[PDB]
Amino acid sequence: FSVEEYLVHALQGSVSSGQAHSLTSLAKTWAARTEDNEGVLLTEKLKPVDYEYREEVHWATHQLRLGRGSFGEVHRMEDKQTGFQCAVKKVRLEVFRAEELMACAGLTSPRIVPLYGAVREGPWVNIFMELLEGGSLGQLVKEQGCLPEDRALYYLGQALEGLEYLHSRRILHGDVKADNVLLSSDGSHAALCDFGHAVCLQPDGLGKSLLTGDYIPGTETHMAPEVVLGRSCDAKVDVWSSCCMMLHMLNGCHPWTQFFRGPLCLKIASEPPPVREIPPSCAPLTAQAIQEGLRKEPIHRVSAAELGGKVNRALQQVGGLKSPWRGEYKEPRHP
């Protein structure tokens, strides 16, 4: 019956210009499962032709800009009829999670990558989204070694707005870190990408994240103790991860890596939070604010909105955003 299912069946076997809600629905079918070509497209700039949107036929990836993404899944692409250019993320069908789209579909904080659509074709789900010419934050830190305190403070702030947005839409991101924040061309704007590890929350219990088939975990070095202990998990998980990213930006390396060899998860469980990785150099309110995000107990840890306030204050005290985004290389901190 479900009136709902009737709408979803109306979507199957084709790709159509449609809305977020349609994409969102049709996506959930993909998580549950010439193997069809189907999907929905959110801009007119990416246009299906005769019920179809096939790679190399209707759209072409640019041979060759570099593949970005952890698995080199992200590519520059072009619509062959329209001439409009954007990014694709490839996700293998048999591990596609509908949360990835839920997290960016439609209503748009500017701290969340714009989703331009998705179509499935064969063993792939192709996700289309605005090309952000600025690159990843992770690229930035690698090119600069590590970042000036004001820049790091500034990007942490814009990630936190994005998180605040998702946490209000009741989705947690699950793997926040520099590689999953994208920059605008001038470096002035950050938005989150890579919602492949996102999860939703319900009334309010507080799901234990890992343990499950469904769930693949975030970056080990950035995971919160309640994740690793197999405890109850919620949005606070992203505020821990975001402070690990902060430490990344300052020191030019991930937390933990420089002190223990592995497995690192046990150390995150057994040991005090890596506040000893805060540079002494830093302003009181910077340190203070990282301290408050790296509380091992998520009930005690600051929310994303709360932390955001603290960093905007730490940005005042350090003297506003002054340093250019691409200046001198800065020596990473040594072991």
Ligand SMILES: COCCOc1cnc(N)nc1-c1c[nH]c2ccc(C#CC(C)(C)O)cc12
């Ligand atoms: C390494 O930085 C190069 C610049 O890359 C990008 C540019 N523009 C966009 N939209 N995404 C990216 C992008 C890079 N890596 C990624 C990893 C994951 C995703 C994603 C995603 C969704 C939103 C589909 O979950 C996008 C990207």
